[PDB]
Amino acid sequence: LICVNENGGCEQYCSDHTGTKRSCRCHEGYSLLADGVSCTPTVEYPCGKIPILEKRNA
Amino acid sequence: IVGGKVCPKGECPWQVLLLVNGAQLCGGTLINTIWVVSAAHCFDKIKNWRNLIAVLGEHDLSEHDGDEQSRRVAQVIIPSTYVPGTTNHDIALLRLHQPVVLTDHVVPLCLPERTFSERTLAFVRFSLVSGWGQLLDRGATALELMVLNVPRLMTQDCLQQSRSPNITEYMFCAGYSDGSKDSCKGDSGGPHATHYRGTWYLTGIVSWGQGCATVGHFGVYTRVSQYIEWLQKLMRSEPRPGVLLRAPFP
Ligand SMILES: O=C(NCc1cccc(-n2ncc(-c3cc4cnccc4[nH]3)c2O)c1)Nc1c(F)cccc1F
Ligand SMILES: [Ca+2]
Ligand SMILES: [Cl-]
Secondary structure, three states: OOOOOHHHHOOOEEEEEOOOEEEEEOOOOEEEOOOOOOEEEOOOOOOOOOHHHHHHOO | OEOOEEOOOOOOOOEEEEEEOOEEEEEEEEOOOOEEEEOHHHHOOOOOOOOEEEEEOOOEOOOOOOOOEEEEEEEEEEEOOOOOOOOOOOOEEEEEOOOOOOEOOEOOOEOOOHHHHHHOHHHOOEEEEEEOOEOOOOOOEOOEOEEEEEEEEOHHHHHHHOOOOOOOOOEEEEOOOOOOOEOOOOOOOOEEEEEEOOEEEEEEEEOOOOOOOOOOOOEEEEEHHHHHHHHHHHHOOOOOOOOEEEEOOO
16 A cells, blocks of 8 residues: 555555555544554544534434 | 635634734634634734734624634744745744633644645545635625635646736645635635545635636635645744744745
């Protein structure tokens, strides 16, 4: 996988590494799941999410 | 905003209103509890640097509903490369005197990594622009926050499709050429926000261009991706006395 393509399969941020390697990362206020791609909030008001809408679908 | 709709209250929770002596100046975008991104040009004519206020959680300017949070602007940081009264490098980073409190109505927009923004976000067609700007060219400003979905153009395409400041690498075009839909005076500094896989990110800043909603022309936006590193470095820095700070760019 490569970051330039399909965002490396990452939900958020992606880094290429030496070899056939990639690491996904998450913004502050998120943590990376064991799938190595997905980001889940770790705080009440993470950036870039709309509370009234997140609740609306909760 | 011309040809948009009312942003339902709380659906644009990163939107900032900038005031000078209680008067509407510009928009902005909250990116952290103490940091706001706006447009440089908003500050070209500031006399009393001490009378700048940022309001978070604003919606309807006609009323007070208790979700608003006002802060003094402690620092206005502008790139060295910005020249007043022009278009290039039209970005400002504002430090609030005290953090805002995050609430259902006050939430930062994510400042993306450069790579991500360039490789991925830059290719998302549509993004939202918002503000309390003019509802029409030569018209009155909005009392309720407005929002508009606009498509982004590759600059080559913009130029071709357009018919006077250059469109530089530090800008991008978005909107419509049919004179129906645009950002406008009073919206400058506000967000151009891009959705990707369930999260919204800051990709542009409402700058300034050919009147507003002018046939044959697109809206021009500051290309935030060019500034990520510059922003990040400044956010890690200690405040300096005196409100205005010109910081080297790059
Ligand atoms: O006066 C200067 N700055 C003060 C200021 C503050 C706040 C707002 C504005 N302002 N005026 C027009 C628009 C505007 C048009 C438009 C159209 N489409 C989208 C967004 C748009 N925004 C705007 O934001 C100006 N600079 C200056 C200089 F320094 C020298 C010469 C001329 C100069 F204008
Ligand atoms: Ca209000
Ligand atoms: Cl001062």
